[PDB]
Every structure is written in structure tokens, then in C-alpha cells.
Amino acid sequence: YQTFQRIVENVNVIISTYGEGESGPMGNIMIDPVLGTVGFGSGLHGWAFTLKQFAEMYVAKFAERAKKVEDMMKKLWGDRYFDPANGKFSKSATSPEGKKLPRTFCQLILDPIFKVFDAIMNFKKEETAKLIEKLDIKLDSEDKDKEGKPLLKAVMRRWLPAGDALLQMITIHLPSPVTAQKYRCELLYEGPPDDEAAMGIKSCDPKGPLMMYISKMVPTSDKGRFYAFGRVFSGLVSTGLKVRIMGPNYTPGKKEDLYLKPIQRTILMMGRYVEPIEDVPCGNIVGLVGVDQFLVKTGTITTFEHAHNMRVMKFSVSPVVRVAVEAKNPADLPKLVEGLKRLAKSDPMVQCIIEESGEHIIAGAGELHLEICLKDLEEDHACIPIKKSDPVVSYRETVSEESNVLCLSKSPNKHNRLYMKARPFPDGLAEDIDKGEVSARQELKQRARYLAEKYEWDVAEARKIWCFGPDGTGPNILTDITKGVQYLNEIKDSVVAGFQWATKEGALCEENMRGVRFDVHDVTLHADAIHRGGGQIIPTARRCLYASVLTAQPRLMEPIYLVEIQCPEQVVGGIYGVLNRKRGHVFEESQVAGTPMFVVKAYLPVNESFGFTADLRSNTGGQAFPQCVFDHWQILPGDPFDNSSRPSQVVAETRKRKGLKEGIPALDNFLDKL
Amino acid sequence: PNEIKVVYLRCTGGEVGATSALAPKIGPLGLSPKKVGDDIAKATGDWKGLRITVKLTIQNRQAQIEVVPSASALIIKALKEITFDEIVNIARQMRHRSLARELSGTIKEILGTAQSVGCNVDGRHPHDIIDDINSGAVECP
Amino acid sequence: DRATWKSNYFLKIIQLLDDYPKCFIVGADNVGSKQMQQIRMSLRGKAVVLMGKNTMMRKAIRGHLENNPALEKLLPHIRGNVGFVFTKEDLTEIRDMLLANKVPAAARAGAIAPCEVTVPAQNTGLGPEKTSFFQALGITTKISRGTIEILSDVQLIKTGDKVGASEATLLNMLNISPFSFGLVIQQVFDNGSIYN
RNA sequence: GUCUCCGUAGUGUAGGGUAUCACGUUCGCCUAACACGCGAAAGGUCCUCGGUUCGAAACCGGGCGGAAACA
RNA sequence: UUGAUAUAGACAGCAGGACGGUGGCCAUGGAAGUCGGAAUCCGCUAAGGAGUGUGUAACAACUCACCUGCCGAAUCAACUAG
């Protein structure tokens, strides 16, 4: 009784602190052993029981039946005691004569089961025989011949079947759909309670607007198709009835994510067995066939033409753990993509995304979750041999400070020469770029005004913007300071193309840079237009730009990204420690309005994320909800120019995977003499 | 409790910072200030001093009084931009002066020695004056 | 430095004993440095406090006070832990303001508590996260208005007993004053005289 | 293991009194243009290190190597 | 053997106190005495190092040398070779 009471008080407390739905919209949620909403049994031995059954045969051995068992059901649980000497209960902890008694609970509930158990584990034969007739349970076949612990199981299973006990308990305590909708739809339908679908869902009138929501999608027997699982909330569904098919990104005023079709058949699911049914009215679960191709992950089904979407499900977990999936054989990529689509269609939380270099990334909750995903993928979703690897961390490059010298390049016919300079960015102007407050589409005068007023930007160069980096929108700016010179206007297209090639196709690891400025100082251009071709300038532009970026003490930066981790009070030290070992720090920690929950946000480098959730669970005892989103980039501390620095290891492995010359070239190939 | 008690201290200064500031991390001690509270705190706290600038915050329901301790460590860096003799004498006078005193000369040694890393009067280390504390050892009283 | 140190202590106490004609004996108990610092500050203008090992004064008075006799009775009067505060003004004023300067000596681990402090029944105001301490110590407390509330006063510790670690930290979080002690005062000396 | 020989333009090559040539790249002539051809330019601290003498890639000592030959 | 401490009371145990600038500078993703590059103070005292170690992401927390209480006579260290 002691352990039972602590367990049930603890569940009461932990439903009080979170489930603010106390008296009011649902009244008393409280879990309480008195009124039979708490059941006792051990599933290994097929038995379960509540106080109610013992109340019943106690009444029997002593309309109005319900109350006459309910009075002593209230009496039995609690601190109230019972005496055997007088065969009467007692609110006192001891007899009037002064002798203590065990409580009514133990004396009338756990004395009998223990008497049953000890006698059969110590093999007490005639005691068992007199108990069975004292327990007046039928003696069926096969139990009078065997013995031992299996006899224990069989006989007390026959005494208290779990089937009837839990069937009756759940029928009397859990609520049927009429009661469920009156307080469930406010978090189910985005539509106002005045719309026609709203009244249907509140009432569950199975003769009007068919409401549906497909959440689980279980695979079929064949291999590639599935059944769409969901519980009907309104209306009555039948075979082949034309119905709107809308998913999450659907908007009522648009046809996107909208489909108009019937269903193929209506199938009930039971265990491993299936059964078609003619029709299903409101309130209950069912599986459907033929809804496979026209839904993604999850969606809803509505007969009504104005019904909006249902509320998309929220997960405490996020697709945080990621692993790359590429086939063993290069000619399985379409097979693989059909596999990934099937996998993403099956489990309603995974995300399959193509990252910038093209890898196929499967993002999920935990390592075991992902493990099951790729197991099913390599078995049935694609049935194709697979190769596994962590996601590759992509890196952007930058310069620490200004290039020391004015870099010079010569055309391969030596008819032209280039003078230019390089700078880093004083602040996160690249962040304003990605935000969009500075962009190519922005006009020259107004963008110039913004730059001059906000970042002390040169007014002379205010009208001298040339390029905005990769694709003309990237976080790299090229301008010109060359004064009064003439054929440079015919070099601009070539220099812009060269700078584009340089930024997209980089220098140290052949990657994109971020937050770097380039200004061309002086140019000596051959008079005629034929000797300074694009194949004669653009290579020189890239040479000179690589020269500059090497001369300026080059640097590397890592995608340090935000981890929003949900955690209770007791193991904030755990997240502190794990972020510390993984080069991470919290910048935002706060308490939530409930009580036990801490919402905590910390910076963490992406390359440190592999296995991060695993050790997080290890140090938290499985008490962490590590949401992960990208935050920003930041300078990687070490200087790649030294070999013994961690950037040097990054650049080496990145060059290795990109299959290039491991050695960084010296300034000889980029910088040339006059 | 004087209608509010958020008297705990803060250790940011110089630039406003704001976003770089720890206001999100020290929100729930008073729960009132938030970013507007941080900004109004630093508007009066931008200057005086120019350092970590430890401050003691006394709430005003919505606003706060960020009284700065006259920390010798803070003020010396606030004064250097060098002899600063009468200035450091005056700075010693403006603090609570207690510093486990026996005499004014005790705090004089303490605050003319506190900047053993910030140098001292012109071309001498902040120790010779401490040994020969005679020039105005009674100048404060 | 030790030899010159002892020489200096002899000399300073000798000079200050020649200077102050009347003194008063204090027992420096298990007292913090903060409280001694603060009283020595409060006493700084009017009196002087000092102490060390309880025997340099013994040798000093027994070997250097023959020329100033009637300074022999302290010899059996200073034993154990002791403190000397030498003052010039009236005795009664010093007595009253010293017994007035009180400090809330906390409930440190492993200390005797000759006082009976029992927790009453009131709303502590604490957040709903520290109830584990009370539930371990045997107090049933339910959250009220978002605050920890103790339903009934229950006895905590008697006199002259040993205090528990979780109990000690309980007293610490509640901030209610445990056994408090500053300067414990035994004997007074006034030019050849003994009193309370 | 010992012994013998040898470490040079990108590549390979010969060689005390400032590294030759071939190809490699650029290159400029010729051609309608390519090819071809020719020309120049660039290009190796001569394996490293210690010594020796006015000075050493050379001469003498080591260390590495590589190659055989014996064992 | 060499040195050191010790009635001005060691050694050892048990009990106390071990503070302000200062969460010293510069490093910072976080470094408060303790990840580190430098400087190395003073007030108070009996005493406290801008720090012995443990520890915290840091705090916090202890711990130490520093001094004091009981304790009242010798003790302790580095070597040496039988």
C-alpha cells in the first residue's frame, strides 16, 4: 500500500502541475484509487483487478447495489483500519483496548492474495483446496493435474480475469465520443464554432459533414501501398463517395494540396487481421485504401467544401538526429528516392531533405528511431544496399582583416593587369543580407543611403556597387574604386563573372565565402577589345581574388546553431555539462508558467551534434527534448594556415572528400609580378 | 518590502550591449524589466563607468536605480584613458571608505595599491608611494 | 618572521596595557571573522580589540609587569579561548553596547544548538521545487497560491543536540535565525578588582 | 645485416671559379586558320646537415634515402 | 650527518575563524582564486594566497597555509650505510 500510495500521489502531483485543466472545462482529472479509476494487475500472468470486484463479493457475502458497493468503496482505500477481532472497521489507528490493526486495504485486499500466493509457492495442498472453495471459483480442466508456478498463474487467472475487470473499469470511467467532442474540438478544428463543420464535430451527427483526419499510415500487404488510418469525427463514410482531400499546406481559398476523389474501400483493422466494412458513421477508427498518393505524412478528409484544416500535431521531439543516406551502387538513386518518399510517408515525424551539396539527409528524434527508419528502408522501402555516414558539415570562409598588399594579376597574353584590395565585414552585415534588408534588388541610391547611415559606408562608393556575391544575392560584395579609367566598364561583366566563380568556387576548400568585401583599385587594360577576352580576364579575376583571400590571413567559420532544449529542474546540470563538453553554452534559461519545466536555449556547433542527443539522454536519464534549428555562423578559433590547427584538419578532410589537391597553393600561382 | 525588492547586482557596463547583455538570463529575479528594463537601466548606465561596471539595481516597479559601487577596480579604469593623484584621493574619499580601516592612511595604501597592474603616479610603480605614504596621509580627513 | 613577530606582539600588548588602565575580558567563541571585523569597526573609535594565543599575554604580564604590580590576578583568569578589548570609557556603556551588538550566527554543520527553534505554520513563499527536503525530513507541505505552505508547526531541534545537514540547509533557506552568538563575556578587570 | 653506386629546372638529365639540354608550362613569330615548325621567357639553394680551405652541387665527414651486389 | 620547530608552548589529534576592491588585467562561447599569458597589492587583523587542491559551464560550495582554542614535552624534515 505504501508504494501504491506514493505512486498515485506522484501521478496526481504531475498531472496537477501540467494539466491545468482542473475544475472547470473538465473538472477533476485527478487519479484516485478510491473510486476504481486505479487498477492492479500483472500482465505476465494475465490478471488485473481493482477495488470494485472485492467490493462486489464483499457486498455479496455480507439500483441500490451500486450505492451499497460505493459506500464501502469510499470506505476501503485510505488510512482507515479494520479489526479482525470484532470484524469491524475503525477510523482509529488502534483498538479501544490499545492494540494496533493493519489497515482495511491490506487486511481485506492483500491478505487474501498473499494467502493464495504463499500457500502455492510453499505447496500447501489442503490449504489451497479449502481456499478455492473459500474463493468459490470454478475448477476447470488441466489445473487439477499440474502444479507449481504455472498452477499459480492458471488458478488466480481463473479467479480474477483481467479481461472483465478492465473492460468494466474502462466502460465506466473513460468517456464516449459525445462527451469527448464537447471539450476536444477546440484543439482539433481551426474553424470557428459557427461554421457548419464545427457543429458537426461538436455534435458528431453522422448524417452531415464527414470529418476525417489521417495521421497513421500503415503499410499494406503488397509492399508499396498503404492504408490511411484515422478516426471519423462527423458524418458517415461509405465506399466510393467523392470527397475533398486536403493536407496541411492547403488553404481554403486555394486548390493547392487539394484533391477531389472518392475512397476505394472502407477497411476495419483488428490486430494482424483486416476486414472490409460497407460503411462507418461518426466517432470511430477505420483504415482506408487508395488515399496513399494524394496525402503526404498526414492530412484530413472532408465532405464539406468550406471546412478548414485540422490542427497539425505537435511533437515534443524534433527531427534532431540526422544521418546521410546514399546507395551502395550509383544506379539506385531513383530507387533510393522512392524509398525515401515511402519512408517519409510512413512515419509521421521524419524529414528527408536534400542539402546544398546534394546529400540525402534523414532527420528524426533518436538514434534508435533513425535506426528503425533505415532498417525498414533497406529492407522494404527500397530493398537496396545502402551506405551510411554522418551529415557533412559545410563551411564558409572569410578573411580576418585587410589584405596586406595590393594584389596584382596578369592576363595570359599579358595585355592587362589588375589592382584590387580585400576587407572583412565589421559586423553581421551578412546577417542583414540574409534577412533581406540589403539585397541586389534594392536600388543603388536607397541601399547606399542605408549602408552609409548604418555602417559608416563610403558615400563615394555608395553608387559603386557591382556584385552581391553568389547568384548575385550571396553575402559577398564587389565594388570599384578605380578612378576615371575607361575600358573597365567593358571589364565589369567579366570581372563580375570572375568574382562569381571565385565566391561560389572558393579558394581554401573550394567553398563559398561569407561577409567579405572586394574593391578593385587600378587597371591597365589593352586598348583594343579582342585581346582581353572573357577567357582572358575571368581566369585572371579568379586568380587575383584567390591571391587576395590568401594574403589576408584566411579564416574558417562553422554553422553554430541553436539548440532549444526542454528540461526539468533536476538535470539542468546535465545539459550544462553536455554543452560544456560539446563546446556549447546556454544564453537563455528560464522557468515556464507551469512549474517543473525549464525552457533552455544554447549555442552549439553542428560538427559537435553527432551523437549529442545520445549523451544528452545518458546524462539526463531520458529527460530531454532537444529541438535543433540553425542560428548563425561564427569564426572558428584556430588558424588554418598552421598545420596543427583544427581548421587545417577541416580543410584537409574537406579537400579529401572533394577529391582535390590536398596542398593549398602558394601565392605564386595567384599573385604574379608586374 | 518597500513595495519591491530586486536589489541584486549586475556586472555589465560601457556599451549598452543589450542583445549581448545578460538581461534574458537575469529576467526572473524581478520579472518586470525585460528588454525595456535593460534599455532603461543602461540609458543611465552607459557612462560611469567604462568597464565591467558592476551595478546594484534597486527596482522602481517599472524602472530601476543602477547605483554603481565606487569599486576602486572600476573607477581606476574609469579614470585612465599618469599621476591622477588628487583624483585617486578624491575617489578614495567618495567610496564607503570602510575597507577594514584603521586610519585614512590605511585606505590610502589600499586604494593607491589596488591598481598594482594599472601603474601609478608618473614613472614609478604603485609601491614606493605606499611605503612612503607621507604626502597628504591626512589630506582626506 | 616568527621570532620578530612574537617580539612585536609582546611589545604592542605591553604598550597598550600601559596605555589603557582598565580592560574587560571577552570569550572569542566559534565566531566568524565578519562579526569580529564589524565590531572592531564599531569599537574602532572608542575602544581597541585584540587577541591571539592565550599565553603571550601571560608571559608578558608575568615577566614585564613587576614594575606595574596588581596585574597578577589575570594569570588564572585567562584560559581556553579568550579575547581582550581595551577601552577607556565607562564600563557599563561598553557592557551594554557589546551585548547589544548581536549577529545571526547561522546553523553550520556539526554545531551544538542549546536553543529550541521550532518551525511554525505559515506560508514560506518558496517555489514548488524544494518540497523534497521537507518530504525527506518528514514535513508534509502542499503548494499554496504557487508557494510552499507548511500546514502545522512541528518540532525541529531541542537544546544541546546535533543538527542535521538537510535540517541545517532548511534553516538556511528559510533564513530564520538559528543559535546566534557573537562575543561571549565573562570577566572584567578594573585596577585590581573582579566583578561579574 | 654488410658492402657498392647514386640523390640536380615540373620531369629527367650531363656538368671548386656563378647549373647544360631535352621535353613540361607560358610565350612570340609564320599561316586565312588549325596543325606543324621555329624562337624566347620562366623554371632546379644540385637530398639534408657539419667541416675543409678566398669561395663547395663538386672536396672531406655524417644523417637520411633509393638502387643493386653479397650475405 | 645536515637542518628546522618548540614554555614566546610545539609535533599530532579534536574545535573555531581563513575577509574588500576583486566576478584584479588580457584573453571569452564560459571562465569569478583555482583552462590559461602576464603582472603578485594593500586595508583588517590572529589570519588569509589576488589562491592548496576538490568542484561548478560559471557560480555555488568545500578544502588547504594562515591564526586561534583544548592539549602541556620534546618534535619534525632531507639524507646516509648495516
mmCIF file of C-alpha atoms in Angstrom, chain A residues 99-329:
data_model
loop_
_atom_site.group_PDB
_atom_site.id
_atom_site.type_symbol
_atom_site.label_atom_id
_atom_site.label_comp_id
_atom_site.label_asym_id
_atom_site.label_seq_id
_atom_site.Cartn_x
_atom_site.Cartn_y
_atom_site.Cartn_z
ATOM 1 C CA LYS A 99 -3.876 -2.936 20.001
ATOM 2 C CA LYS A 100 -2.929 -1.684 16.542
ATOM 3 C CA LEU A 101 -4.595 -3.090 13.435
ATOM 4 C CA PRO A 102 -3.463 -3.286 9.813
ATOM 5 C CA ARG A 103 -5.467 -1.074 7.512
ATOM 6 C CA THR A 104 -8.637 -2.151 5.715
ATOM 7 C CA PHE A 105 -6.717 -2.152 2.429
ATOM 8 C CA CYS A 106 -4.071 -4.690 3.434
ATOM 9 C CA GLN A 107 -6.350 -6.774 5.647
ATOM 10 C CA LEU A 108 -9.115 -7.230 3.066
ATOM 11 C CA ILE A 109 -7.180 -6.958 -0.232
ATOM 12 C CA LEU A 110 -3.585 -8.118 0.205
ATOM 13 C CA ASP A 111 -4.030 -10.655 2.990
ATOM 14 C CA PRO A 112 -6.072 -12.872 0.602
ATOM 15 C CA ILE A 113 -3.751 -12.623 -2.403
ATOM 16 C CA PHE A 114 -0.736 -13.278 -0.189
ATOM 17 C CA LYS A 115 -2.516 -16.259 1.376
ATOM 18 C CA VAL A 116 -3.108 -17.523 -2.161
ATOM 19 C CA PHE A 117 0.494 -16.929 -3.182
ATOM 20 C CA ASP A 118 2.495 -18.260 -0.230
ATOM 21 C CA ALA A 119 0.437 -21.450 0.005
ATOM 22 C CA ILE A 120 1.111 -22.239 -3.661
ATOM 23 C CA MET A 121 4.797 -21.272 -3.647
ATOM 24 C CA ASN A 122 5.273 -23.359 -0.481
ATOM 25 C CA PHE A 123 2.964 -26.028 -1.963
ATOM 26 C CA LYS A 124 0.251 -26.173 0.708
ATOM 27 C CA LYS A 125 -2.235 -28.653 -0.698
ATOM 28 C CA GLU A 126 -5.293 -28.890 1.560
ATOM 29 C CA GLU A 127 -4.931 -25.200 2.385
ATOM 30 C CA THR A 128 -5.223 -24.498 -1.342
ATOM 31 C CA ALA A 129 -8.196 -26.862 -1.586
ATOM 32 C CA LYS A 130 -10.067 -25.132 1.235
ATOM 33 C CA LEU A 131 -9.113 -21.731 -0.197
ATOM 34 C CA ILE A 132 -10.534 -22.472 -3.652
ATOM 35 C CA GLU A 133 -13.891 -23.342 -2.102
ATOM 36 C CA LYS A 134 -13.440 -20.365 0.222
ATOM 37 C CA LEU A 135 -12.742 -18.450 -3.001
ATOM 38 C CA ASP A 136 -15.619 -20.409 -4.664
ATOM 39 C CA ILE A 137 -14.003 -20.296 -8.103
ATOM 40 C CA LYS A 138 -14.738 -22.992 -10.652
ATOM 41 C CA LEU A 139 -12.114 -25.688 -11.132
ATOM 42 C CA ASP A 140 -11.755 -26.097 -14.891
ATOM 43 C CA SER A 141 -9.658 -28.684 -16.740
ATOM 44 C CA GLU A 142 -5.861 -29.089 -16.809
ATOM 45 C CA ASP A 143 -5.445 -27.248 -13.478
ATOM 46 C CA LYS A 144 -6.106 -30.137 -11.075
ATOM 47 C CA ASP A 145 -3.186 -32.167 -12.502
ATOM 48 C CA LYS A 146 -0.366 -29.651 -12.965
ATOM 49 C CA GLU A 147 1.382 -27.784 -10.164
ATOM 50 C CA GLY A 148 3.903 -25.090 -9.357
ATOM 51 C CA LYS A 149 4.127 -21.523 -10.568
ATOM 52 C CA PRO A 150 2.072 -22.314 -13.740
ATOM 53 C CA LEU A 151 -0.667 -23.586 -11.427
ATOM 54 C CA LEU A 152 -0.373 -20.276 -9.584
ATOM 55 C CA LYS A 153 -0.888 -18.382 -12.782
ATOM 56 C CA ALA A 154 -3.739 -20.522 -14.080
ATOM 57 C CA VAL A 155 -5.739 -20.651 -10.871
ATOM 58 C CA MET A 156 -5.545 -16.972 -9.999
ATOM 59 C CA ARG A 157 -6.133 -16.002 -13.615
ATOM 60 C CA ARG A 158 -9.314 -18.020 -13.360
ATOM 61 C CA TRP A 159 -10.001 -16.187 -10.112
ATOM 62 C CA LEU A 160 -9.629 -12.622 -11.415
ATOM 63 C CA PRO A 161 -9.554 -12.339 -15.205
ATOM 64 C CA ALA A 162 -8.065 -9.069 -16.387
ATOM 65 C CA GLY A 163 -10.469 -9.020 -19.331
ATOM 66 C CA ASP A 164 -13.696 -8.402 -17.430
ATOM 67 C CA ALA A 165 -12.009 -6.205 -14.817
ATOM 68 C CA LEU A 166 -10.506 -3.723 -17.240
ATOM 69 C CA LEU A 167 -13.436 -3.952 -19.648
ATOM 70 C CA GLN A 168 -15.832 -2.873 -16.893
ATOM 71 C CA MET A 169 -13.453 -0.259 -15.468
ATOM 72 C CA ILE A 170 -12.850 1.457 -18.801
ATOM 73 C CA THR A 171 -16.510 1.280 -19.769
ATOM 74 C CA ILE A 172 -17.462 3.060 -16.555
ATOM 75 C CA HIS A 173 -14.638 5.622 -16.397
ATOM 76 C CA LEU A 174 -13.450 6.508 -19.893
ATOM 77 C CA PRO A 175 -15.726 8.793 -21.925
ATOM 78 C CA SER A 176 -17.505 8.016 -25.172
ATOM 79 C CA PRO A 177 -17.234 10.390 -28.164
ATOM 80 C CA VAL A 178 -20.286 12.522 -27.309
ATOM 81 C CA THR A 179 -18.510 13.547 -24.114
ATOM 82 C CA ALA A 180 -15.131 13.717 -25.873
ATOM 83 C CA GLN A 181 -16.011 16.202 -28.610
ATOM 84 C CA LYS A 182 -17.625 18.734 -26.272
ATOM 85 C CA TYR A 183 -14.135 19.505 -24.933
ATOM 86 C CA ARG A 184 -11.858 18.073 -27.640
ATOM 87 C CA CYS A 185 -12.619 20.044 -30.824
ATOM 88 C CA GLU A 186 -11.224 23.374 -29.593
ATOM 89 C CA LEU A 187 -7.762 21.914 -30.248
ATOM 90 C CA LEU A 188 -8.937 19.919 -33.290
ATOM 91 C CA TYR A 189 -10.533 22.284 -35.839
ATOM 92 C CA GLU A 190 -9.207 25.727 -36.744
ATOM 93 C CA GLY A 191 -12.667 26.761 -37.939
ATOM 94 C CA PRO A 192 -14.883 28.988 -35.819
ATOM 95 C CA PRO A 193 -17.557 27.165 -33.789
ATOM 96 C CA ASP A 194 -20.185 28.791 -36.043
ATOM 97 C CA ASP A 195 -19.185 27.031 -39.274
ATOM 98 C CA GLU A 196 -21.236 24.022 -40.353
ATOM 99 C CA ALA A 197 -18.306 21.628 -39.899
ATOM 100 C CA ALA A 198 -17.833 22.952 -36.362
ATOM 101 C CA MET A 199 -21.320 21.962 -35.255
ATOM 102 C CA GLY A 200 -20.889 18.546 -36.835
ATOM 103 C CA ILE A 201 -17.630 17.916 -34.992
ATOM 104 C CA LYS A 202 -19.075 19.179 -31.694
ATOM 105 C CA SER A 203 -22.194 17.012 -32.030
ATOM 106 C CA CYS A 204 -20.948 14.027 -34.067
ATOM 107 C CA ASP A 205 -24.110 13.902 -36.142
ATOM 108 C CA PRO A 206 -23.317 11.045 -38.545
ATOM 109 C CA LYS A 207 -25.577 12.349 -41.303
ATOM 110 C CA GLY A 208 -23.840 15.571 -42.314
ATOM 111 C CA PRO A 209 -20.351 16.906 -42.858
ATOM 112 C CA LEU A 210 -17.985 13.945 -42.925
ATOM 113 C CA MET A 211 -14.912 14.968 -40.952
ATOM 114 C CA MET A 212 -11.701 12.957 -41.020
ATOM 115 C CA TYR A 213 -8.047 13.256 -40.088
ATOM 116 C CA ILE A 214 -5.498 10.752 -41.389
ATOM 117 C CA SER A 215 -2.498 10.535 -39.053
ATOM 118 C CA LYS A 216 -1.069 7.000 -39.163
ATOM 119 C CA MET A 217 -0.343 5.324 -42.491
ATOM 120 C CA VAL A 218 0.324 1.591 -42.090
ATOM 121 C CA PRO A 219 1.907 -0.354 -44.984
ATOM 122 C CA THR A 220 -0.247 -2.748 -46.990
ATOM 123 C CA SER A 221 0.403 -6.424 -47.609
ATOM 124 C CA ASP A 222 1.881 -5.898 -51.086
ATOM 125 C CA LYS A 223 4.848 -3.569 -50.368
ATOM 126 C CA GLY A 224 4.475 -0.119 -51.908
ATOM 127 C CA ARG A 225 0.971 0.966 -50.940
ATOM 128 C CA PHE A 226 -0.582 1.708 -47.559
ATOM 129 C CA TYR A 227 -3.792 2.214 -45.615
ATOM 130 C CA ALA A 228 -4.686 5.671 -44.320
ATOM 131 C CA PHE A 229 -5.644 5.408 -40.642
ATOM 132 C CA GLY A 230 -7.913 7.893 -38.901
ATOM 133 C CA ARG A 231 -10.946 8.206 -36.669
ATOM 134 C CA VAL A 232 -14.165 9.613 -38.096
ATOM 135 C CA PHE A 233 -15.391 12.637 -36.168
ATOM 136 C CA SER A 234 -18.552 13.502 -38.117
ATOM 137 C CA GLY A 235 -20.720 12.121 -40.886
ATOM 138 C CA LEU A 236 -20.957 8.612 -42.317
ATOM 139 C CA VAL A 237 -18.413 7.265 -44.801
ATOM 140 C CA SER A 238 -19.136 4.627 -47.439
ATOM 141 C CA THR A 239 -17.424 3.140 -50.465
ATOM 142 C CA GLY A 240 -16.717 5.378 -53.442
ATOM 143 C CA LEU A 241 -18.051 8.734 -52.224
ATOM 144 C CA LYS A 242 -16.429 11.758 -53.844
ATOM 145 C CA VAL A 243 -14.713 13.768 -51.126
ATOM 146 C CA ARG A 244 -12.290 16.649 -50.899
ATOM 147 C CA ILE A 245 -8.731 15.666 -49.964
ATOM 148 C CA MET A 246 -6.719 18.471 -48.353
ATOM 149 C CA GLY A 247 -3.477 18.361 -46.429
ATOM 150 C CA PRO A 248 -1.552 20.724 -44.193
ATOM 151 C CA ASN A 249 -0.319 23.383 -46.621
ATOM 152 C CA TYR A 250 -3.821 23.628 -48.088
ATOM 153 C CA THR A 251 -5.550 26.991 -47.758
ATOM 154 C CA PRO A 252 -9.350 27.283 -48.027
ATOM 155 C CA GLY A 253 -9.118 29.883 -50.794
ATOM 156 C CA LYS A 254 -6.742 27.862 -52.985
ATOM 157 C CA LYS A 255 -6.564 24.461 -54.688
ATOM 158 C CA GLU A 256 -3.015 23.638 -53.557
ATOM 159 C CA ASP A 257 -2.825 20.426 -51.506
ATOM 160 C CA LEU A 258 -6.429 19.877 -52.592
ATOM 161 C CA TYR A 259 -7.774 16.704 -54.173
ATOM 162 C CA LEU A 260 -11.323 15.691 -55.109
ATOM 163 C CA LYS A 261 -11.778 11.917 -55.276
ATOM 164 C CA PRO A 262 -13.648 9.041 -53.640
ATOM 165 C CA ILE A 263 -12.088 6.322 -51.494
ATOM 166 C CA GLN A 264 -11.544 2.778 -52.710
ATOM 167 C CA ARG A 265 -12.971 0.722 -49.818
ATOM 168 C CA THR A 266 -13.547 1.046 -46.077
ATOM 169 C CA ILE A 267 -11.497 -1.435 -44.053
ATOM 170 C CA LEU A 268 -11.519 -2.165 -40.338
ATOM 171 C CA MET A 269 -8.234 -3.046 -38.642
ATOM 172 C CA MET A 270 -8.076 -5.702 -35.905
ATOM 173 C CA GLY A 271 -4.658 -6.879 -34.724
ATOM 174 C CA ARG A 272 -2.910 -8.511 -37.658
ATOM 175 C CA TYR A 273 -6.203 -9.244 -39.411
ATOM 176 C CA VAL A 274 -8.128 -6.862 -41.654
ATOM 177 C CA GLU A 275 -11.769 -6.645 -42.637
ATOM 178 C CA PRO A 276 -13.651 -4.520 -45.171
ATOM 179 C CA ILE A 277 -16.837 -2.875 -43.940
ATOM 180 C CA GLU A 278 -19.614 -1.343 -46.008
ATOM 181 C CA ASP A 279 -19.596 1.973 -44.158
ATOM 182 C CA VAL A 280 -18.590 3.808 -40.984
ATOM 183 C CA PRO A 281 -20.542 6.626 -39.299
ATOM 184 C CA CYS A 282 -19.012 9.128 -36.910
ATOM 185 C CA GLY A 283 -16.933 8.567 -33.804
ATOM 186 C CA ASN A 284 -14.693 5.623 -34.594
ATOM 187 C CA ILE A 285 -11.472 4.487 -36.203
ATOM 188 C CA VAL A 286 -11.064 2.962 -39.659
ATOM 189 C CA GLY A 287 -8.485 2.346 -42.359
ATOM 190 C CA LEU A 288 -8.901 3.402 -45.979
ATOM 191 C CA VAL A 289 -7.308 2.324 -49.255
ATOM 192 C CA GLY A 290 -6.406 4.467 -52.258
ATOM 193 C CA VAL A 291 -5.639 7.632 -50.270
ATOM 194 C CA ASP A 292 -1.943 6.811 -50.473
ATOM 195 C CA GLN A 293 -0.680 9.033 -53.286
ATOM 196 C CA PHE A 294 -2.757 12.129 -52.534
ATOM 197 C CA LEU A 295 -1.604 12.680 -48.946
ATOM 198 C CA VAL A 296 1.854 13.383 -47.538
ATOM 199 C CA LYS A 297 2.652 12.266 -43.987
ATOM 200 C CA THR A 298 -0.795 13.297 -42.724
ATOM 201 C CA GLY A 299 -3.950 15.057 -43.821
ATOM 202 C CA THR A 300 -7.704 15.374 -43.495
ATOM 203 C CA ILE A 301 -10.810 14.287 -45.394
ATOM 204 C CA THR A 302 -13.916 16.448 -45.628
ATOM 205 C CA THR A 303 -17.192 16.201 -47.479
ATOM 206 C CA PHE A 304 -17.841 19.871 -46.710
ATOM 207 C CA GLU A 305 -16.433 22.412 -49.165
ATOM 208 C CA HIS A 306 -15.685 25.167 -46.615
ATOM 209 C CA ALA A 307 -14.051 23.040 -43.907
ATOM 210 C CA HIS A 308 -10.589 24.267 -42.959
ATOM 211 C CA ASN A 309 -7.657 22.116 -41.850
ATOM 212 C CA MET A 310 -7.292 20.308 -38.556
ATOM 213 C CA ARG A 311 -4.596 21.354 -36.095
ATOM 214 C CA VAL A 312 -1.304 19.780 -37.146
ATOM 215 C CA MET A 313 0.142 17.526 -34.473
ATOM 216 C CA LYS A 314 2.933 18.858 -32.260
ATOM 217 C CA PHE A 315 5.813 16.655 -31.133
ATOM 218 C CA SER A 316 7.896 17.174 -28.021
ATOM 219 C CA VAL A 317 10.786 15.781 -30.070
ATOM 220 C CA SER A 318 12.093 17.322 -33.279
ATOM 221 C CA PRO A 319 13.928 15.834 -36.251
ATOM 222 C CA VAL A 320 17.236 16.489 -34.498
ATOM 223 C CA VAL A 321 19.307 13.379 -35.211
ATOM 224 C CA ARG A 322 20.491 13.244 -38.812
ATOM 225 C CA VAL A 323 22.351 10.691 -40.933
ATOM 226 C CA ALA A 324 23.207 10.743 -44.640
ATOM 227 C CA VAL A 325 21.769 8.049 -46.927
ATOM 228 C CA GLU A 326 23.370 7.213 -50.269
ATOM 229 C CA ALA A 327 23.121 3.908 -52.103
ATOM 230 C CA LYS A 328 25.945 1.410 -52.421
ATOM 231 C CA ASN A 329 25.536 1.379 -56.164
#
